[PDB]
Amino acid sequence: SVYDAAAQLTADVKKDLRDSWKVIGSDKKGNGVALMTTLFADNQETIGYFKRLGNVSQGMANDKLRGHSITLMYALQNFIDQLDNPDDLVCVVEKFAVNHITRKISAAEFGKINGPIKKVLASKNFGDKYANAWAKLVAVVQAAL
Amino acid sequence: SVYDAAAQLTADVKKDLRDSWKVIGSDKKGNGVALMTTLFADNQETIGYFKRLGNVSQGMANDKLRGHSITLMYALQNFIDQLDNPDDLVCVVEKFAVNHITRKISAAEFGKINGPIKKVLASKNFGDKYANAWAKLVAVVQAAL
Numbered sequence: 001s002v003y004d005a006a007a008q009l010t011a012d013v014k015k016d017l018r019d020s021w022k023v024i025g026s027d028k029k030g031n032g033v034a035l036m037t038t039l040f041a042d043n044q045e046t047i048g049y050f051k052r053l054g055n056v057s058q059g060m061a062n063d064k065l066r067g068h069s070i071t072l073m074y075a076l077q078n079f080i081d082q083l084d085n086p087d088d089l090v091c092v093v094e095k096f097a098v099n100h101i102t103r104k105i106s107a108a109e110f111g112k113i114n115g116p117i118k119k120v121l122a123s124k125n126f127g128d129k130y131a132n133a134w135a136k137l138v139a140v141v142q143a144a145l
Numbered sequence: 146s147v148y149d150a151a152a153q154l155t156a157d158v159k160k161d162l163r164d165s166w167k168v169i170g171s172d173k174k175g176n177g178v179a180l181m182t183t184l185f186a187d188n189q190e191t192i193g194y195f196k197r198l199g200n201v202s203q204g205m206a207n208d209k210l211r212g213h214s215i216t217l218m219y220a221l222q223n224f225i226d227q228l229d230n231p232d233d234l235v236c237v238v239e240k241f242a243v244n245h246i247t248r249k250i251s252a253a254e255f256g257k258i259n260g261p262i263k264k265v266l267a268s269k270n271f272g273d274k275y276a277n278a279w280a281k282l283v284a285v286v287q288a289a290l
């Protein structure tokens with residue numbers, strides 16, 4: 001269950017998430033757009049899913065892309081704030097899962113975000129340990145897909 | 146025009162938003178759910194739009210309502226964090242406007258949240274001055290619908 005995946009995140013994983021989020025979450029516009037543009041660069045097959053945003057190659061200049069990317073960073077803020085209450089984490093993960101289920105995004109496709117997260121973290125010198133912690137949070141969402 | 150509406154957020158208004166958000170934003174779960182249950186109690190005719198959340202009369206005990214409500218408070222957080230930059234505020238407002246346009250929510254119906262906001266504010270000892278500041282931020286969204 002989602003709860004199981006949630007309930008599993010340990011004190012050390014939560015620490016590494018919070019520590020790296022302090023940095024990555026401090027520039028939501030810049031890091032959110034880098035996350036999205038990295039997804040599109042590395043996984044070109046996903047571009048079609050984002051047709052509402054218009055020409056995503058425009059980066060920061062594309063207002064729809066910038067609004068989406070900032071907002072995505074607040075979904076991660078939300079998850080980070082809920083880490084200590086699995087019950088609250090589960091209900092917000094289930095809400096965002098629905099946003100993706102309705103777009104036909106599978107658990108495997110959702111996991112394509114791990115590559116972009118690892119690259120953004122690495123840009124701030126957070127290494128593999130940090131990328132592994134983030135994959136475990138992503139895995140909570142995958143449990144709902 | 147969203148841009149004209151955004152221009153109405155003067156220095157004084159911004160300060161009153163930030164000062165009151167310091168208090169209401171500190172309990173996203175509790176204040177989020179209070180806002181929604183106040184909406185539903187005072188404006189019963191809007192309940193039908195929220196079919197996906199199930200039995201909203203259950204309040205905090207309804208997991209879907211709790212997840213939705215927490216998330217709504219992060220939309221507000223997002224707006225407050227964008228007050229420094231009007232181009233960023235506008236692009237996040239337009240993102241959320243689309244979420245409501247697709248649900249067939251008009252500017253007038255969206256404005257039904259002003260009553261609930263005033264009540265939640267008043268419950269924390271923030272009076273009309275603060276409710277009016279909040280109505281100016283809601284008006285930015287209304288301009289986009």
Ligand code: HEM
Pocket residue numbers: 046049050051052053068071072075076096099100103105109110111112113244
């Ligand atoms: C860290 C991981 C992710 C988070 C936190 C996240 C969060 C979000 C949020 C907050 C939205 C807006 C939902 C709405 O307003 O309806 C969204 C939309 C969307 N997401 Fe994600 N997402 C993630 C990863 C992905 C991945 C990996 C894909 C596809 C492979 C994906 C596909 C979509 C699509 C197609 C939309 C709708 C875009 C639009 O038309 O507005 N997401 N996501």
Ligand code: HEM
Pocket residue numbers: 099191194195196197198213216217220221241244245248250254255256257258283
């Ligand atoms: C301060 C004002 C409000 C804010 C910040 C806000 C924010 C949000 C957000 C962030 C969502 C989730 C969007 C998604 O995942 O698709 C949402 C959904 C929704 N909102 Fe609002 N909202 C506000 C007021 C209203 C009002 C007054 C109404 C109706 C009169 C309304 C109707 C809806 C509906 C029907 C949904 C979809 C619920 C569901 O099926 O998940 N909103 N809103």
